[PDB]
Amino acid sequence: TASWFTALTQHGKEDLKFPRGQGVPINTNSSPDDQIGYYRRATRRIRGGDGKMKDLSPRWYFYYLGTGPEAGLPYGANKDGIIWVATEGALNTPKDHIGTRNPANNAAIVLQLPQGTTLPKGFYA
Numbered sequence: 001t002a003s004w005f006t007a008l009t010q011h012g013k014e015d016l017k018f019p020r021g022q023g024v025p026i027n028t029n030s031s032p033d034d035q036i037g038y039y040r041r042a043t044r045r046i047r048g049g050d051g052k053m054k055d056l057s058p059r060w061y062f063y064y065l066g067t068g069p070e071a072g073l074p075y076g077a078n079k080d081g082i083i084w085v086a087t088e089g090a091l092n093t094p095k096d097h098i099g100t101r102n103p104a105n106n107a108a109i110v111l112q113l114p115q116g117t118t119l120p121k122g123f124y125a
């Protein structure tokens with residue numbers, strides 16, 4: 001199981017965060033009640049060439065509230081690597097009817113944000 005969407009990549013040194021009311025990827029199969037979730041940070045490192053580990057740019061993946069690797073965390077719960085996003089008017093209920101993605105059945109939806117959304121500096125898709 002995986003995120004329904006492709007990642008955001010962090011080039012700066014701050015964690016992801018969105019203005020209140022923006023941040024949820026567009027998904028034409030979801031309703032206005034579903035527009036709420038969290039982004040989870042994913043780290044990666046490689047043997048850097050000098051024999052030492054090299055940290056790569058963190059990526060951040062979105063999961064609907066109540067799904068994914070932190071399916072049990074309630075909205076706004078404070079956990080390192082977890083940041084919360086919601087469209088105004090989204091219901092605060094688990095989205096188990098959307099679930100997570102099986103890569104052996106569906107590729108990721110290309111991540112895109114609703115118009116007028118400001119990504120923090122150093123974050124790109």
Ligand SMILES: O=c1ccn([C@@H]2O[C@H](COP(=O)(O)O)[C@@H](O)[C@H]2O)c(=O)[nH]1
Pocket residue numbers: 001002003004040041042061103108
């Ligand atoms: O936190 C993560 C890491 C990978 N993925 C995606 O899951 C898929 C499989 O990743 P994996 O081979 O590293 O398990 C691939 O499409 C990744 O981009 C997530 O959805 N969330």
